[PDB]
Design a protein around this ligand. Structure first.
Ligand SMILES: OC[C@H]1O[C@H](O)[C@@H](O)[C@@H](O)[C@@H]1O
Ligand SMILES: OC[C@H]1O[C@H](O)[C@@H](O)[C@@H](O)[C@@H]1O
Ligand SMILES: OC[C@H]1O[C@H](O)[C@@H](O)[C@@H](O)[C@@H]1O
Ligand SMILES: [Ca+2]
Ligand SMILES: [Ca+2]
Ligand SMILES: [Ca+2]
Ligand SMILES: [Ca+2]
Ligand SMILES: [Ca+2]
Ligand SMILES: [Ca+2]
Ligand SMILES: [Ca+2]
Ligand SMILES: [Ca+2]
Ligand SMILES: [Ca+2]
Ligand SMILES: [Cl-]
Ligand SMILES: [Cl-]
Ligand SMILES: [Cl-]
Lengths: 142, 142, 142
């Protein structure tokens, strides 16, 4: 079976290598990020990522933030991130319900104070709280 | 080894997630469908799919039919399916030799009665028996 | 676990099938070749392939040569290969340090005699020793 396992691991590396060369994914630690280049609103990005078997991307580390920012830069668009401050204002949570730890707010942000429940990322990787109805680059994590 | 197996399964899911996000595959049950968007005749589609390690797509379930129809719709072209009524007329078989079960004939079809040995799918997912020399969207199953 | 292993192997085959259909990879024996279609110099191709988890492509067999030549033909560009004759002139080595075995020099080549330390492949698959600063099609192996 060890023959099978080595071969399997090698083939997985080949396919991920191919996708990484084609610019179709970025691997960061345990996470893989990807975009198909389309721009839609926050709710539609969630459905899109979920349909593909993943989730709207969120950076929980400086390294993850840089990877998503590099995607925002390459595709030159603002990006919606997987966090919201719905139920309680000023209190941003990941979509799994956990309170946000790492942040990278653009100076002055977040300033919505009720009416801005989503978070967008600028091309320099910094964050702004925003309404959820804008068209933003869809980035998913797997 | 359980560490290896969990990691392997996760990486497989990441790559399939990426391909699904990019619109490069559709997963239905055990089957994966894909097209590269090219149009060729029936014999050439078979060679193309076989070269890639798969087979010309055929729907054996309503669910599979819908998936292929969604590809025909997205690419806006008629699609050749993996069935033929060669040796016996009115008797359509899969390419593995088995008699066809599920069908979705457009009203009046099949009407070839000798001279139409292939099957094409319209953009609404319904079927027509047809000659095999037309240029149709190549869709493969894996 | 056998259920897991069969399923894993099948899913790997599906993803590789998809990538092969999309024209995003060529499998030869143990090797997988891929290009993203970009043209850069020798040093930049190495970095690009390494970033993706692979290496600049080199043919060690007639079969591997044909696969890379088919990529050079499809993309209609000269290709840099993973071999150099740096430290000793007339003495080409793979990037792992081993002396080159299989060759396919265009008639008259190699003729650099000091000043041509890289190797390019023409669209017909034959080789020429060349300087390393030209823009060539980036082809990686995994
Ligand atoms: O000045 C920046 C400011 O501009 C707009 O009002 C909105 O996008 C706010 O979310 C943002 O904080
Ligand atoms: O009326 C539809 C009819 O049109 C043509 O004659 C052919 O494509 C037939 O296969 C099809 O049944
Ligand atoms: O005649 C072919 C000859 O042309 C140029 O001088 C260079 O590309 C050489 O590397 C090559 O050998
Ligand atoms: Ca609110
Ligand atoms: Ca708010
Ligand atoms: Ca704001
Ligand atoms: Ca006939
Ligand atoms: Ca017939
Ligand atoms: Ca007919
Ligand atoms: Ca030299
Ligand atoms: Ca030389
Ligand atoms: Ca030369
Ligand atoms: Cl809004
Ligand atoms: Cl015909
Ligand atoms: Cl040069």
């Amino acid at each position: 079976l060890q023959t099978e396992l080595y071969e399997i691991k090698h083939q997985i590396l080949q396919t991920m290598g191919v996708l990484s060369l084609q610019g179709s994914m970025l691997s960061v630690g345990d996470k893989v990020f990807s975009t198909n280049g389309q721009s839609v609103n926050f709710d539609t990005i969630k459905e899109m990522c979920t349909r593909a078997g993943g989730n709207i991307a969120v950076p929980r580390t400086p390294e993850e933030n840089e990877a998503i920012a590099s995607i925002a830069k390459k595709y030159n668009n603002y990006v919606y991130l997987g966090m919201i401050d719905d139920q309680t204002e000023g209190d941003f949570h990941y979509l799994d319900g956990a309170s946000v730890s790492y942040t990278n707010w653009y100076p002055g942000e977040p300033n919505g104070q009720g009416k801005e429940d989503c978070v967008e990322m600028y091309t320099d990787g910094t964050w702004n709280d925003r309404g959820c109805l804008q068209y933003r680059l869809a980035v998913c994590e797997f």
